[PDB]
């Protein structure tokens, strides 16, 4: 008793209780107001004529891209040119490089203008089959400036057939007024900040760089007590650069996730095991950024803490608008398999966004969020990238194609 019905659809259900990819026999998939109502062997029946024949196609849940900075103006490419060319980092931050030249960028956009620049991309994602993005703010460093991104973020997520998670950054660098009084603007973040974007329902979560050259463990700690007060999720960037104890930090907060994680230790994965974080991976920053300290995933599998797997799509560290390139990359990269970087981004990317209950799996009572792919076995979504392969793309029961 449901109003749509997909007929004969080899599902890849990637169901936290079943092994690998969780594929079944072909299925019929019916949905009911925006969910899976239900999931039947096609051996179990022999329509109406609205129901939609797949014949035997692959369906898999929606991707989802957990971590991205892709609202943004400006672009680094000629700086990057520059240090190509051997010209001194020196001088191009002297000269005002950087992530400060994005941030002055996107303070001097217009909130019309982010959300135009940010259609394209986001548009991008639309097509790999990502049903759910989570996009941070932390490029406008002023009250203002940072909930105008996060308004951007709404409007995206209203214009576009795309659910749109947003993450409150402001502590994603000290901004200029404040160089010489960095705690000045942890007081601001805290006391303004997140006051004005949980009353506007603005932030979804709440972020955080914390690193020798981004926010101490002390100054995170401030952070994550406020967005605690307004109840507010958690997460962070952690042990991207060096190990302060983020991770540890972050895992007693009950955060969400932990981001990069390239210098996480020990201790800090038994945190992680513990809290039921998740472990973000973002190969594509690690690659642009040329970094040689891999993530422990080895350690992580041993401790059984899930990976999610993300674009890091941002204009500094890793312009590269692709959720599958990210999934090769974990593969190639990191070592994971194509099944772990599937489960990276469905169920654990799901979990990451505080969504394990309604979705990243095909489960009924969970949100009608799937994909019909004409390509025959899951593995090749981590393996083939860039080609436009998605027959169906529904979200909340609908479909997004056309
Ligand atoms: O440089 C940028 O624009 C963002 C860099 C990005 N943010 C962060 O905390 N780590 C990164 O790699
Ligand atoms: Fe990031």
């Not at 997520?157 to 942890?186: F, M, N, Q």
């Not at 590269?320 to 169920?347: D, H, K």
Request: net charge negative; hydrophobic share 45%; proline share 5%.
């Amino acid at each position: 008793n449901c109003e749509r019905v997909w007929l004969n659809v080899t599902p890849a259900t990637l169901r936290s209780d079943l092994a690998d990819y969780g594929l079944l026999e072909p299925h019929a998939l019916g949905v009911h107001e925006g969910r899976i109502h239900a999931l039947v062997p096609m051996q179990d029946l022999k329509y109406p004529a609205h129901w939609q024949d797949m014949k035997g196609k692959l369906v898999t849940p929606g991707l989802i891209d957990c971590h991205t900075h892709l609202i943004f103006a400006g672009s680094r490419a000629e700086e990057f040119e520059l240090r190509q060319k051997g010209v001194p980092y020196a001088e191009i931050a002297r000269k005002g490089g950087g992530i400060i030249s994005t941030v002055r960028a996107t303070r001097a956009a217009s909130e019309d203008q982010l959300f135009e620049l940010a259609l394209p991309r986001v548009k991008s994602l639309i097509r790999e089959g990502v049903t759910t993005v989570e996009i941070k703010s932390g490029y406008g460093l002023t009250l203002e400036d940072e909930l105008k991104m996060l308004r951007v973020a709404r409007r995206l997520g209203e214009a576009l057939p795309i659910r749109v998670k947003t993450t409150l950054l402001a502590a994603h660098a000290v901004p200029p007024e404040y160089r010489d009084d960095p705690d000045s603007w942890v007081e601001t973040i805290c006391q303004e900040i997140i006051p004005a974007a949980a009353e506007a329902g603005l932030a979804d979560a709440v972020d955080v760089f914390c690193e020798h050259i981004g926010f101490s463990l002390a100054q995170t700690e401030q952070v994550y007590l406020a967005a605690d007060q307004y109840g507010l999720a958690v997460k962070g960037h952690m042990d991207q650069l060096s190990n302060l104890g983020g991770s540890t930090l972050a895992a007693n907060f009950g955060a969400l996730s932990v981001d990069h994680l390239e210098y996480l230790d020990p201790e800090g994965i038994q945190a992680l095991a513990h809290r039921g974080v998740v472990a973000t991976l973002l190969p594509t920053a690690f690659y642009f950024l040329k970094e040689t300290k891999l993530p422990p995933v080895v350690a992580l599998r041993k401790a059984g803490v899930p990976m999610a797997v993300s674009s890091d799509i941002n204009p500094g560290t890793a312009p590269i608008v692709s959720l599958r390139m990210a999934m090769n990359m974990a593969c190639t990269l990191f070592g994971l398999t194509p099944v772990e970087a599937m489960a990276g981004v469905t169920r654990h990317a799901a979990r990451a966004l505080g969504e394990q209950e309604q979705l990243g799996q095909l489960r009924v009572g969970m949100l009608a969020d799937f994909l019909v792919w004409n390509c025959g076995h899951p593995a090749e979504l981590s393996y083939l990238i860039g080609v436009d392969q998605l027959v169906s793309r529904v979200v909340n029961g609908e479909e997004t194609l056309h």
